[PDB]
Design an enzyme around this catalytic site. Structure first.
Site, PDB file in Angstrom:
ATOM      1  CG  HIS A  12      14.981  -9.398  -9.792  1.00 34.86           C
ATOM      2  ND1 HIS A  12      14.337  -8.857 -10.883  1.00 34.86           N
ATOM      3  CD2 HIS A  12      14.997  -8.437  -8.850  1.00 34.86           C
ATOM      4  CE1 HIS A  12      13.992  -7.600 -10.609  1.00 34.86           C
ATOM      5  NE2 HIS A  12      14.395  -7.320  -9.360  1.00 34.86           N
ATOM      6  CE  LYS A  41       9.466  -4.231 -10.689  1.00 34.20           C
ATOM      7  NZ  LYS A  41      10.603  -5.093 -10.310  1.00 34.20           N
ATOM      8  CG  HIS A 119      18.731  -2.349  -8.271  1.00 38.08           C
ATOM      9  ND1 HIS A 119      17.444  -1.904  -8.556  1.00 38.08           N
ATOM     10  CD2 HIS A 119      19.517  -1.877  -9.276  1.00 38.08           C
ATOM     11  CE1 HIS A 119      17.450  -1.233  -9.699  1.00 38.08           C
ATOM     12  NE2 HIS A 119      18.705  -1.207 -10.158  1.00 38.08           N
ATOM     13  CG  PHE A 120      17.746  -7.524 -12.436  1.00 37.91           C
ATOM     14  CD1 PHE A 120      17.591  -6.886 -13.651  1.00 37.91           C
ATOM     15  CD2 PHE A 120      18.337  -8.780 -12.409  1.00 37.91           C
ATOM     16  CE1 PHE A 120      17.994  -7.497 -14.818  1.00 37.91           C
ATOM     17  CE2 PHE A 120      18.735  -9.391 -13.582  1.00 37.91           C
ATOM     18  CZ  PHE A 120      18.567  -8.745 -14.786  1.00 37.91           C
ATOM     19  CG  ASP A 121      21.641  -1.133 -12.678  1.00 38.30           C
ATOM     20  OD1 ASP A 121      20.931  -0.408 -11.946  1.00 38.30           O
ATOM     21  OD2 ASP A 121      22.397  -0.704 -13.544  1.00 38.30           O
TER      22      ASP A 121
HETATM   23  N1  LIG Z   1      22.648   1.093  -7.301  1.00 40.71           N
HETATM   24  C1  LIG Z   1      21.424   0.820  -6.871  1.00 40.71           C
HETATM   25  N2  LIG Z   1      20.365   1.143  -7.656  1.00 40.71           N
HETATM   26  C2  LIG Z   1      19.131   0.859  -7.216  1.00 40.71           C
HETATM   27  N3  LIG Z   1      18.765   0.245  -6.093  1.00 40.71           N
HETATM   28  C3  LIG Z   1      19.840  -0.092  -5.346  1.00 40.71           C
HETATM   29  C4  LIG Z   1      21.168   0.157  -5.654  1.00 40.71           C
HETATM   30  N4  LIG Z   1      22.010  -0.315  -4.650  1.00 40.71           N
HETATM   31  C5  LIG Z   1      21.189  -0.850  -3.779  1.00 40.71           C
HETATM   32  N5  LIG Z   1      19.859  -0.733  -4.126  1.00 40.71           N
HETATM   33  C6  LIG Z   1      18.712  -1.280  -3.400  1.00 40.71           C
HETATM   34  O1  LIG Z   1      17.901  -1.952  -4.340  1.00 40.71           O
HETATM   35  C7  LIG Z   1      16.501  -1.877  -3.974  1.00 40.71           C
HETATM   36  C8  LIG Z   1      15.692  -1.529  -5.206  1.00 40.71           C
HETATM   37  O2  LIG Z   1      15.846  -2.582  -6.215  1.00 40.71           O
HETATM   38  P1  LIG Z   1      14.640  -2.894  -7.282  1.00 40.71           P
HETATM   39  O3  LIG Z   1      13.390  -3.153  -6.450  1.00 40.71           O
HETATM   40  O4  LIG Z   1      15.079  -4.123  -8.100  1.00 40.71           O
HETATM   41  O5  LIG Z   1      14.502  -1.644  -8.133  1.00 40.71           O
HETATM   42  C9  LIG Z   1      16.431  -0.901  -2.784  1.00 40.71           C
HETATM   43  O6  LIG Z   1      16.138  -1.590  -1.572  1.00 40.71           O
HETATM   44  C10 LIG Z   1      17.822  -0.253  -2.709  1.00 40.71           C
HETATM   45  O7  LIG Z   1      18.286  -0.077  -1.386  1.00 40.71           O
END
Ligand SMILES: Nc1ncnc2c1ncn2[C@@H]1O[C@H](COP(=O)(O)O)[C@@H](O)[C@H]1O
Length: 124
Positions: A12, A41, A119-121
């Site tokens: 990100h 991806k 994490h990017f929400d």
């Molecule tokens: N609320 C959350 N939602 C999703 N992933 C999370 C959250 N909090 C922490 N994580 C961490 O974020 C990673 C996934 O992020 P991503 O790869 O951007 O989807 C994992 O290693 C999770 O442990």
């Protein structure tokens, strides 16, 4: 393996430019960050701000994550971001992406010591 904090930076964080120069930014970046290795991806956002400014989001607006955890944070300010989204005709291994440049608030999940994005929400 690679920590969640370091994976967040790989996936990100692009401090190197203030914005997406070319329409091939996403094609190039998604490759260089190892996001097209096994599969394409489909969707990914790069943040064009300082790591310090992105890490500071973890003490800004606390909100629910999409998964319903409550350790997510919305940037008070808009940030320079690029949305990469796979084209309709994209086939692995020749992954193709539409680059969309934008100024939007980011929402990140924060964890650990130091308390940083893992994490990017979403962008809003
Ligand atoms: N609320 C959350 N939602 C999703 N992933 C999370 C959250 N909090 C922490 N994580 C961490 O974020 C990673 C996934 O992020 P991503 O790869 O951007 O989807 C994992 O290693 C999770 O442990």
């Amino acid at each position: 393996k690679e920590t969640a904090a370091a994976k967040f930076e790989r996936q990100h964080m692009d401090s190197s430019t203030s914005a997406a120069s070319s329409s091939n930014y996403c094609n190039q970046m998604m490759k260089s960050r190892n996001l097209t290795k096994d599969r394409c991806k489909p969707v990914n956002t790069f943040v064009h701000e300082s790591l310090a400014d992105v890490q500071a989001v973890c003490s800004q607006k606390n909100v629910a994550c999409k998964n319903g955890q409550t350790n997510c944070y919305q940037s008070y300010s808009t940030m320079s971001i690029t949305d990469c989204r796979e084209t309709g005709s994209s086939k692995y291994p020749n992954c193709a992406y539409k680059t969309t440049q934008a100024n939007k608030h980011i929402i990140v999940a924060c964890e650990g010591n130091p308390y940083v994005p893992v994490h990017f929400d979403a962008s809003v």
